[PDB]
């Protein structure tokens, strides 16, 4: 990771953005006031 240079082994995948998007879509705040 970033707080852990030790990261999960991978050669072609997608991990962080995946859960990121899961939580994002979960928000349902179609007008999410944010960044």
């Amino acid at each position: 990771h970033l707080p852990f240079s030790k990261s999960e082994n991978p050669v072609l995948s997608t991990i962080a953005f995946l859960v990121g998007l899961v939580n994002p879509k979960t928000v349902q705040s179609m007008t999410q006031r944010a960044i």
């Binding site: 999960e8 995948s13 997608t14 991990i15 962080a16 995946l18 859960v19 998007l21 899961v22």
Partner: peptide, 29 residues
Amino acid sequence: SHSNIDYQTLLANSDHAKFTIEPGVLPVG
């Protein structure tokens, strides 16, 4: 009709005491 592939809706409800999961969320990590 179909596309060999299933999907999820957005109008169902919750017992609020479930015991089922599914790899449609990608918590990979």
